[PDB]
Amino acid sequence: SHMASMKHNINDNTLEIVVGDITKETTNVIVNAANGSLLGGGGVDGAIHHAAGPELLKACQEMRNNELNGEELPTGEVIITSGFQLPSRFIIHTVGPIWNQTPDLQEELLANCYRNALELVKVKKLSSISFPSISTGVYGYPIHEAAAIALQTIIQFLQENDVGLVKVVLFSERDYSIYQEKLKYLIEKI
Ligand SMILES: Nc1ncnc2c1ncn2[C@@H]1O[C@H](COP(=O)(O)OP(=O)(O)OC[C@H]2O[C@H](O)[C@H](O)[C@@H]2O)[C@@H](O)[C@H]1O
């Protein structure tokens, strides 16, 4: 029942980090750590598909067959679907880098997930979004490095743009603790 949280205001925006389950967030948008196929998986992708219900998979399949003409979603890029049975209005699906598959591009590619998702929130005039810890599960990205990239990217975006609320939802107290220390470090540098 205790779930740690902390927040920081950046101009008129708010950045919050929390322990929780992203499928229970009532932000306008939640972000899925997907794979290029968009057909689901385990971890957060599996949780989102289970919570959203079977209409999500159908929607992803139709997006693959029509708008993508069978192509997979590239690493760092985003697509948007409805939230279906989630408490959110939309799901932004992204694909994080698989750790050390492309060592010279992966920091940029991870940042892209966050920047592209936030640009889409801006475009659609949505005012709240939740992120998971993209790429730090099965994709193997070290949490200390990923948390730095995630937070630096979000902070920079919120310094330069009006968005609203950005939440990072950590699934463990271990990840939360690391995020908290990184966020505090980054705030002191502002
Ligand atoms: N309900 C949840 N809410 C928030 N975070 C969660 C939840 N469940 C897990 N996490 C955390 O979410 C974070 C990311 O872990 P992972 O979900 O493996 O994502 P990746 O980007 O590394 O792997 C993508 C692949 O895994 C899938 O099969 C896809 O289809 C791809 O094949 C971790 O901190 C988890 O503990």
Residue numbers in the entry: -4 to 185
Lines quoted from the article behind this entry:
Electron-density (ED) maps of native crystals soaked with ADPr (OiMacroD-ADPr) or ADP (OiMacroD-ADP) show a large mass of ED that matches an ADPr or ADP molecule bound to the enzyme and follows the same pattern found in other MacroD-like structures. The adenine moiety is stacked in a hydrophobic pocket with the highly conserved residues F166, I17 and V39. In addition, it is also strongly bound to residues D16 and I17 by main-chain interactions, which belong to the highly conserved sequence DIT in Block I. The pyrophosphate moiety of ADPr exhibits a rich network of contacts, which are decisive for ADPr binding. Residues S130, G132, V133 and Y134, belonging to the P-loop-like motif (Block IV), and V39 (Block III) in helix α1, are directly involved in diphosphate binding. Residue G37 (loop β3–α1) anchors the distal ribose 1″-OH group, whereas the 2″-OH group is bound to residues N30 (loop β3–α1) and D40 (helix α1).
To expand our knowledge concerning the field of macrodomains, we have characterized Oceanobacillus iheyensis macrodomain (OiMacroD), the first to be described from the order Bacillales. A yield of 40 mg of pure protein per litre of culture after a simple two-step purification process was obtained. The subunit has a mixed α/β fold, similar to that of other nucleotide-binding proteins, composed of a central seven-stranded mixed β-sheet (β1–β2–β7–β6–β3–β5–β4) and five α-helices.
